[PDB]
Ligand binder design. Structure first.
Ligand SMILES: Cc1cc2nc3c(=O)[nH]c(=O)nc-3n(C[C@H](O)[C@H](O)[C@H](O)COP(=O)(O)OP(=O)(O)OC[C@H]3O[C@@H](n4cnc5c(N)ncnc54)[C@H](O)[C@@H]3O)c2cc1C
Ligand SMILES: CCCCC/C=C\C=C\CCCCCCCCC(=O)O
Length: 423
């Protein structure tokens, strides 16, 4: 429905933008340009060097059902070749426990998991589709805990919480089930629970760097876009060094932030203003009494413990002078959010409690993480509206807000965007 000769501007060279480029190009659209604000590609797949090995400041892992990322590796020749992930569980006092072996709670949890699985397989078919343009069951629009309570599956939250809340995506009291279950669908949940998890020796960034290089048009970097306007059936992009016209705009960058440098119409301003996000903070640490395994702290995943370390990543087992990254959240809709300063101190205090005291923090990043909307906004039909706007003034909406904030979901979405509107 769009001509192959169209000049397509793709904003952002993260996974979503690079995938958009890949799949446009493979569909015969050769006149695309990817515009990246920073000097690097990969976005939140960001794998810096330290003493000859790359550590992860952002994304780390995948599961075997990451089919779109497999397609990307097929193209780049990259392989899943990183160190194996292994985990223990700690209480907030640092004591090691084995929740799977609890003879009372364990069965309750796994019975709820069984029950939920069947609801997903029968009543809630369609729940796991990529994106939100196929309207999900109304129950899925409620916060996850409410969704679970409606079906008597509350205890299943013990299994779902670990790769969700600890992983920055927020808390089941408020995050709609729709996101939780598109990310952690039954198969994905099962893979995680099993530890069947992809990692990369060269970092998740590496395959995106390699993908960018395979493109007919590798991303243009250091592009400071000051204004985008969309008059006369055209797209006009003003940057600090040039201003140029395009036929189509594909956005893989934060849509609320897009309002600030664009001729955003009333609907764009109205809806994109409803976007909320997570403040997910990662500290790259050198530690004494080096851990022997990664640690998760369910106690610190409760909203009452906001800002505490929920998980830390043991990446390079053989070298106790390698980087251990820690993970915490600074926000929750029903709490005063936490400062960088007080959270950094909890990193220190928590790691000390866990028996792996921090000697040095070499890097720290609060990420713009998991853009989404509230249950109320989801229920009021946020996605019916925005997806209805796809193509308005030659503009297409993609990236994390349109799908889910993991790198397979956004790439899958970019791939399908080509199929939906372009081919
Ligand atoms: C700590 C952490 C851990 C994670 N763990 C995992 C994991 O284990 N597995 C997984 O699948 N996912 C994980 N993720 C999520 C995953 O990294 C993201 O969902 C994915 O990178 C999203 O891709 P994207 O292209 O939509 O957005 P992004 O990765 O954020 O890329 C956006 C790009 O657009 C650029 N940009 C922003 N504004 C502008 C502008 N004004 N003009 C031009 N360019 C702009 C940015 O610089 C960036 O390059 C993790 C993320 C973090 C932060
Ligand atoms: C199902 C996993 C794919 C998506 C993951 C998305 C976000 C992850 C965010 C942060 C992860 C912190 C990692 C700590 C190491 C885990 C070790 C283990 O689980 O065995």
């Amino acid at each position: 429905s769009i001509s192959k000769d169209s000049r397509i501007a793709i904003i952002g060279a993260g996974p979503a933008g690079l995938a958009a480029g890949m799949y446009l190009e493979q569909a015969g659209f050769h006149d695309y340009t990817i515009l990246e604000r920073t000097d690097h590609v990969g976005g939140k797949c960001h794998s810096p060097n330290y003493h000859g090995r790359r550590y992860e400041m952002g994304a780390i892992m995948g599961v075997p059902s990451y089919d779109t990322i497999q397609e990307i590796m097929d193209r780049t020749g990259d392989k899943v070749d990183g160190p194996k992930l292994r985990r223990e569980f700690l209480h907030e006092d640092g004591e090691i426990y084995v929740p799977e072996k609890d003879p009372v709670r364990g069965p309750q949890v796994m019975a709820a998991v069984q029950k939920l699985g069947q609801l997903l397989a029968t009543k809630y078919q369609g729940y796991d589709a990529n994106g939100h343009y196929n309207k999900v069951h109304e129950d899925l629009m409620l916060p996850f805990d409410e969704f679970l309570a409606l079906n008597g599956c509350e205890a299943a939250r013990d299994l779902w919480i670990n790769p969700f809340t600890a992983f920055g995506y927020g808390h089941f009291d408020n995050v709609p089930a729709a996101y939780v279950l598109k990310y952690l669908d039954f198969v994905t949940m099962m893979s995680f629970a099993k530890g069947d998890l992809w990692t990369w020796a060269d970092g998740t960034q590496a395959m995106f760097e390699h993908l960018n290089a395979t493109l007919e048009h590798p991303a243009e970097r250091n592009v400071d876009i000051t204004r985008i306007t969309r008059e006369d059936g055209k797209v006009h992009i003003h940057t600090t060094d040039w201003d140029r016209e395009s036929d189509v705009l594909v956005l893989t960058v934060p849509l609320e932030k897009f309002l600030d440098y664009s001729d955003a119409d009333d609907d764009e301003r109205e809806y994109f203003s409803k976007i909320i996000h997570q403040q997910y903070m990662v500290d790259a640490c050198l530690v004494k009494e080096y851990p022997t395994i990664s640690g998760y702290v369910p106690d610190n995943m409760r909203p009452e413990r906001l800002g505490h370390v929920m998980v830390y990543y043991h990446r390079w087992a053989d070298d106790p002078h390698q980087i251990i990254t820690t993970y915490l959240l600074r926000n929750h809709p029903d709490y005063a959010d936490k400062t960088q300063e007080e959270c950094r101190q909890m990193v220190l205090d928590d790691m000390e409690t866990f028996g792996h005291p921090v000697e040095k923090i070499i890097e720290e990043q609060t990420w713009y993480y998991f853009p989404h909307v509230s249950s109320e906004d989801y229920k009021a039909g946020w996605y019916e509206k925005v997806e209805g706007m796809q193509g308005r003034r030659n503009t297409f909406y993609a990236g994390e807000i349109m799908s889910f904030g993991n790198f397979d979901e956004v790439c899958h979405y970019s791939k399908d965007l080509v199929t939906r509107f372009f081919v």
